[PDB]
Amino acid sequence: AECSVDIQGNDQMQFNTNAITVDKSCKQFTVNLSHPGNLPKNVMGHNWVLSTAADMQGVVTDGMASGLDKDYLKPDDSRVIAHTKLIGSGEKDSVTFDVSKLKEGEQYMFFCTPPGHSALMKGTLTLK
Ligand SMILES: [Cu+2]
Structure with missing residues (x-):
């Protein structure tokens, strides 16, 4: 409903949006x-991974290095505000997170951390 979004990642390393808007009144x-x-x-x-814009580089660098068995995320990475698991074709996963983790006026980025994907599979997340 108002406090969710569906996103797809395909075999060509594309997400189907590059911008997500979150109603700032969503809990x-x-x-x-x-x-x-x-x-x-x-x-x-x-996967779908959320961080500040400033933290994305580091999250991607350490995530890509972490390997398939770690879903290409640094274990215990405090910069990752929320993330789904890593999924293959035909699979699905959902993540829920607390909108109080997020600041009106802050610049957020979502992205896919696997090797080769993050520059091609990223977008903004902003409160409205
Ligand atoms: Cu990807």
Whole structure:
């Protein structure tokens, strides 16, 4: 409903949006991630990861280094505000997070951390 969004990552390393708006009065927000296509998780897995704009580089750098078995996220990374798990084609995962984690006027970015994906699979998240 108003406090959720559906996003897709496909076999061509595309998310289907580059901008998410969250109603600032939502108590929680949910992202429902899915993966059209047929490529398996070990080839074309995707996740959905939220951080500040400033933290994204570091999250991506350490995430890509962390490997498939760690969903390409640094374990215990305090910069990651919220994340789904890593999913392959035909799979689905949802994450819910507390909108009080987020500041009106702050610049947030969502992105996919797997090797080769983050520059191609990113966007803004902003409160309205
Ligand atoms: Cu991806």
